[PDB]
Structures are given as C-alpha cells and as structure tokens.
C-alpha cells in the first residue's frame, strides 16, 4: 500500500458550497486531509457514505481536517448531483472532479477497465504523509465514526511521539 | 484525419429512451451511423447542439441513420441530465458513456489534458467507413441541417458510384 | 483531430492573380486563414467547391480572412487551370502548390496511396490555432455558406470570451 | 490497491495451538479469511492488536471466518512469543511465519527498508477475492469490532447482491 | 547508378492519345522501353525535349520501342497540357502521371525537396534491364538522335553477343 508515503502534486477543479474552486496539493500543506474516493455520481449506494462524512464534517473541521471527495466525474456533474439529491445537498466540503484520472492514479486507486475510482479513503497529515488507508468493495460501507477515531489517534501520536 | 478509415471495435454502456443498454461496433454494421462527441454533461452550450440533432432524428431514422452521442461522462450521468434538462429530454437516440475514454481515443478525439472529448461529429457508412468529419472549438457550433445534407449526399454517392 | 493545435511552419509557391508568390506561416500570423485542401487540378468536381469560396471572398476579405487553396499540383499547374476554366478564373485568393506534400502532411491530410490531399478545410485564427475542421469523402461537398457561418462565430467568441 | 483481486498462491509454516502446520492458499478456499499483518514479534504495541482479534476469534469462527496473523518472523519465533506473553498466549488462530517476505509482498505490504510488514488487514472471501483492506501507521490501531462489522457486511452483500438501502 | 539492374514494379495512370490508361511493369515485358523523366508540366523548357522525342516516335515504334514520359504531375494535368501546347499536342506516346513519386523513386530520380523528377532518361530491354542512363541539369539538352544511337547499339549487342 501507499502507507507512510507522501502525497503527489495535483491540480483539480471542485464544487464547494455553491462555487467552483481549484484545489492543489498546496492547499493540503500544514493541514490534516481526508481524500474520500468513490466510483460515480448519480448512483445509489455512494451518497450515504458521503452523507455520513457530511454529518461528521463540523467535528472534522474543528479538528483541523479538510475533506475532499473524489470521483472521475466532472465538477459540473458534482454541482448537479448536489442540487438534485438531498443527501448530497448536505455536503459542505470540496467535491473534486478528476476526469483525467490523474488524482485517482496518484493514489493508485483507478479501476482501469472502468475508468472509475475504487472506494478508498486516505488520511493525510500536515506533512503530506498518508497515515491511514481504508478500501472496501461495494456494499461493505465506510463508517465515518471509525474514520474520526483513526484521525484522533493519528493526531494524538503526532503530538505525543512514543506511545499509542 | 480519419477520413475513409474503418471505425474500430468498441463496447460501451448507454442510456437510450429510458433504459441502459450496451452498444458495440457490431450494432453499427449494416447501418449509417453518426457519432456526435461533446465535452461534458451539465454544462450550458452542449444541449442546443444535441437538441438540434434530436429535432432531425425522426428524419434520420427514416433514412436508416442511427445517432450516438458520446462524452466521457457515465450513462448514469446521461440519464440524470435527461431528467433535468428540457432540451436533453427530447433525445431518443443512445447517449453513450465513455468514462475510460476508449471510444473517444478510437476516433482520435480526446483532449488528454482535460479527460474530455472534443466537439467532433463522424458520419460512418454501413461498412464502417468514415465518410465525413466535422470538428469545432468552443463557441463555434455544429449545424444539424448541414449534417443532414452531408448524410443525404453520402447516401446518394453510395447508391450512384461514379458520377 | 488537429483541433486547437497550432499550425506548423511552411514555405510554398503559390499562384495569386497572375503572379507567382511565396507563402509561409509568417503571412498567416495576425490574420484569420482558411486552408482549403482539394485532390487535383483539371478534374471536374473541385472547381465548383473552389468557385463557391471565391463567391464569398470579398466578404471574407472584409472580415480580415485570407484564403489559401492547396493541392499537391504545382503553382505552374494552378496558373494554367486558372487560364482554362472560367470557374477557376474567378479566384483571387492564393492557390498554393504542394508537390512535396509537406504542407498537406503538416495538416495530416495526405492520402498517401494517391499522393493527393483529402477534401479538408481548416480555419486558423491570428495566433495560428485551428478553430474548425471539415473533411469529406468524394462527392459529399463542402458548403461555403456553412464555412462563412463558422468563421463569423469563431470571430465572435474571440472577441467576446465566455459568451456564445 | 489490491481491492477486488484474487489472492496469490503461497505456502508458509505457522504456529497454531501448540503445533507447527503448513498453510497454503488451498486452505483458504471456500472460507472467509482475515490476513492480519504486523511488523515484529517480541515488541510492545502489536500484542494488544493481536489480542483484540483473539478476543473476537470465537465470534469470527461462528461466522465461518478463519484468521491468519503474519509477520516476517519465523514460526519458531511465534511459538516462543506464544509461550512468553500472556496476551499472545490467548491466540488460537494460526500465526504464519514469512521470512522470505513472499506472503507479505503478495499483498504488496512490505516496508522494504525495514524488512517488516506494514500494519495491514485484508478480508478475503471464499473465492479468494479481497473485499476489504485497512492499513494504518504506528500508534493508530486497528479496531477488531469494526473488522467484525465489515466482515458481516461483506457476508451480507455476498448472500444478497444488488439489494439496496 | 541503376545501370544493369532490373526495373521495379509500378502501376500508374497515363494519358495516351486522347484517352486514359493504366501502365504497369507487365506492359514493358518483351518490349524495349524508354522512360523519359521531366520536372513539371506547364513550364517553358521541357516541351521541346519531349517534342524532340515525339518526332522520332514512329521510328522508335518500328524498332520495337515503347516510350513513356513521366513527371509527378497527374494524368489529368498531362491531358490538359496536351490541349494547351502545340508542341505537347504532337505527343503520341504515353504520358505517365506519378503523383505519389513511387515510379520516380524506383528509378532513384526524385529531387526530394521539390517533389519533382530530375531530367533523366532510362533505356530498358525486354528483360527489364536498364541498359543506358542519361541525366542532365536544367538547360543542357537531351538530344533524341543520340538516344536512337544508344538504343540501336543496345539492340545490336543483345542479338550479337560480344
Ligand atoms: Cl494503497
Ligand atoms: Cl480525424
Ligand atoms: Cl485533423
Ligand atoms: Cl493494497
Ligand atoms: Cl541511376
Ligand atoms: K469521466
Ligand atoms: K503533383
Ligand atoms: K525477519
Ligand atoms: Na483495481
């Protein structure tokens, strides 16, 4: 896996709370980040995983954690999904579009025969180092509460080296 | 250009008139086909170009011509766009999703730095041979009635070799 | 296709209005240009296509658009054709000869088995960028009216970034 | 990642309930499997993690799930750790030795500059397909109850595909 | 040079006395052939050399010699040049069009940076063997009577070894 490696440079458009923005690796420097990949917009399972992160987003932000969801759809499509779905409408974090697949390939997370990212979550520290990875097949679900736990533990170890 | 070359094999998912189907090169064999590429769903310009073609679709179907629109979006996204845009809702031809880019690259039509297809139309005859190509940059616009003229001309020449 | 790519340097002889001239990419810099390729002089279909563009040439010039017709014949052959055909005699734009096939290959438009150019039209903006392309098989025909519409729309969006 | 790929063949010695045994991919066929990698025996953090899985092992076995822990130590070393640590002593699942690192590298899970496996857990279905992956850095810890939840969810979607809530 | 080598196969359209024909290597087999290359139709200098050859054409025909002029112009252009120029109009042999340059390149006679053949004449015997080569720069002429000299000689040595 990519554990304990540094994230690679990237530049992507995103939809975030009603506007289009550009995100690059420079935006992650000095911050905690979650990169939350999923296969496709306008599908039936993904929203509740994304929705579960949205439910925890206020707490994450208090911990100084930025959240970026990523699929190979465009930011135009994310904006439409956000208007049309009430689960997605509660997302206030950045929804990155990755239609070249470059961000997804940076995280070695592309299904090449489908052109879609796998269901993978990466926790990245202020120095750009991947501290946790979770990947699941369809239907197995990613629990945002267990994600919060890992982030708090990763922040703890960073602040107090030499104990778990 | 790809003019007078044979189209390449492909297999894609599509949204067509309320259902999801698979489209391959074998469905084009023995028919006239239009492959109408565009950059992205849920943008502002593309729909009236696609809608133009939809207006002419009954006539095209009378001439034995199938229409396939293509972008690197998914068929899921095409279905959503079709339910949200009054213009896209008119479309009764297949909307192919090409998220791997393979179909777009077959037609040498990928903007690689963007992962989107360029605005290109290809007219393909029942033997798979590309008989007309049109490509435009943003803002310039494709005229569906010029497309029909070219299709009719292509069919005439097919039916009156040497003239 | 070559859409949104920059034209390549070239140097060719041309017949224009009784004179032999040299055309290079420098003549296209800062101008709109139409490169109108065709297979062969002294054939029977091509004159109509070329004559139709000639009919629009006054207006194209008014709009700051130069026209170059191109085949793999020589500029000598173009001069003769201009004397013999009254449709070709209408032509006041440059008729480029491309016997090395180099200009035709710059535009990826050679039928290599015949040594003749395919029936292709390229619109090139003042920065040398290809903004529109049309290629047709024998007998289908290019409509100069649609060409004129396309040039006007390309000029419009150059002048009004974002809009139509 | 390796998600949705088939596990590669392997053959390794292991210590399990007072015996040395051989384990290969054939032993995993037709069963749910958990491959629990950790860096090194006779260290201080690892055993609480192995112990947590040990606590949940009876429940895992009633779900038809086999557990294999893996480090690049030998099976001899596992046997000795099992005699010396009261925490490791409660392990009843197989402790696989991977001194060549081949089982670790099959799962793309080697820290090459240390020759130790990273802290990764893989859930493998009865067809050999990897259905869940978790990897953590030191100190972050792996929650065996969250593992059990994922295993039940994977069993559920296997039994009832395309079902949607 | 290509002397004493066998010509390569080719397939070209030509204009010959009011009509269009295909010429291939097969049409030279069993016959003597002259391939007369020139740079371009509808220029000033070339017609006299082609004319010079035209004058001697019935004589050649009675020696068993087929004539083929070649430029990288098309046969459409050759037809047109025929109507336009009195000189060219008196040609009765085949004017081959070589727009792909392949026939020219078979005889290694392409000026690559112009896409035009050089001024070269090749004599080919019934077995396809090149027996005489002449190449001249612009302005220096190619005199047809010297070509008849060379051909008659070439035929002598063929029927009378040594
Ligand atoms: Cl990974
Ligand atoms: Cl093309
Ligand atoms: Cl092109
Ligand atoms: Cl992995
Ligand atoms: Cl030679
Ligand atoms: K895409
Ligand atoms: K030529
Ligand atoms: K070791
Ligand atoms: Na994959």
Swiss-Prot record, chains A, C:
Gene Ontology CC annotations of this record: cytosol
Superkingdom assignment: Bacteria
GO process terms (BP): cell redox homeostasis; hydrogen peroxide catabolic process; response to oxidative stress
Molecular function terms, GO-annotated: NADH-dependent peroxiredoxin activity; thioredoxin peroxidase activity
Main location: cytoplasm
Keywords noted in UniProt: Antioxidant, Cytoplasm, Disulfide bond, Oxidoreductase, Peroxidase, Redox-active center
SUPFAM superfamilies cross-referenced by the UniProt entry: Thioredoxin-like
Enzymatic reactions: a hydroperoxide + NADH + H(+) = an alcohol + NAD(+) + H2O
InterPro entries reported for this sequence: AhpC, AhpC/TSA, Peroxiredoxin, Peroxiredoxin_AhpC-typ, Peroxiredoxin_C, Thioredoxin-like_sf, Thioredoxin_domain
Pfam families documented for this protein: 1-cysPrx_C (PF10417), AhpC-TSA (PF00578)
EC id: 1.11.1.26
Residue ranges that the Swiss-Prot or TrEMBL entry lists as coiled coil: none
Function per UniProt: Thiol-specific peroxidase that catalyzes the reduction of hydrogen peroxide and organic hydroperoxides to water and alcohols, respectively. Plays a role in cell protection against oxidative stress by detoxifying peroxides.
Quaternary assembly: Homodimer; disulfide-linked, upon oxidation. 5 homodimers assemble to form a ring-like decamer.
Family classification: Belongs to the peroxiredoxin family. AhpC/Prx1 subfamily.
Misc remark: The active site is a conserved redox-active cysteine residue, the peroxidatic cysteine (C(P)), which makes the nucleophilic attack on the peroxide substrate. The peroxide oxidizes the C(P)-SH to cysteine sulfenic acid (C(P)-SOH), which then reacts with another cysteine residue, the resolving cysteine (C(R)), to form a disulfide bridge. The disulfide is subsequently reduced by an appropriate electron donor to complete the catalytic cycle. In this typical 2-Cys peroxiredoxin, C(R) is provided by the other dimeric subunit to form an intersubunit disulfide.
NCBIfam families: AhpC
PANTHER family according to UniProt: ALKYL HYDROPEROXIDE REDUCTASE C, THIOREDOXIN PEROXIDASE
Name used for this protein in its record: Alkyl hydroperoxide reductase C
Curated annotation (Swiss-Prot), chain E:
Origin superkingdom: Bacteria
Catalytic residues identified in the record: 46
Major site of localization recorded for this protein: cytoplasm
CDD domains in the record: PRX_Typ2cys
SUPFAM superfamilies xrefs: Thioredoxin-like (SSF52833)
Keywords: Antioxidant, Cytoplasm, Disulfide bond, Oxidoreductase, Peroxidase, Redox-active center
Keyword hit for Cytoplasm: yes
Described purpose of this protein according to its UniProt entry: Thiol-specific peroxidase that catalyzes the reduction of hydrogen peroxide and organic hydroperoxides to water and alcohols, respectively. Plays a role in cell protection against oxidative stress by detoxifying peroxides.
Family: Belongs to the peroxiredoxin family. AhpC/Prx1 subfamily.
Additional remark text: The active site is a conserved redox-active cysteine residue, the peroxidatic cysteine (C(P)), which makes the nucleophilic attack on the peroxide substrate. The peroxide oxidizes the C(P)-SH to cysteine sulfenic acid (C(P)-SOH), which then reacts with another cysteine residue, the resolving cysteine (C(R)), to form a disulfide bridge. The disulfide is subsequently reduced by an appropriate electron donor to complete the catalytic cycle. In this typical 2-Cys peroxiredoxin, C(R) is provided by the other dimeric subunit to form an intersubunit disulfide.
Protein's UniProt name: Alkyl hydroperoxide reductase C
């Amino acid at each position: 896996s990519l554990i304990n490696t540094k994230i690679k440079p990237f530049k992507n458009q995103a939809f975030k709370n009603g506007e289009f923005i550009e995100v690059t690796e420079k935006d992650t420097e000095g911050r905690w980040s979650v990169f939350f990949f999923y296969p496709a917009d306008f599908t039936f399972v993904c929203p509740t995983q994304l929705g579960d992160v949205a439910d925890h987003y206020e707490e994450l932000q208090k911990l100084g954690v930025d959240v970026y969801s990523v699929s190979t759809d465009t930011h135009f499509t994310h904006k439409a999904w956000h208007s049309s779905s009430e689960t997605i409408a509660k997302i206030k974090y950045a929804m990155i579009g990755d239609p070249t697949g470059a961000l997804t390939r940076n995280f070695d997370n592309m299904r090449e025969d489908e052109g879609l990212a796998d269901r993978a979550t990466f926790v990245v520290d202020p120095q750009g180092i991947i501290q946790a990875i979770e990947v699941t097949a369809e239907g197995i679900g990613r629990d945002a509460s267990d994600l919060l736990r890992k982030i708090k533990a990763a922040q703890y170890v960073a602040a107090h080296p030499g104990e778990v």
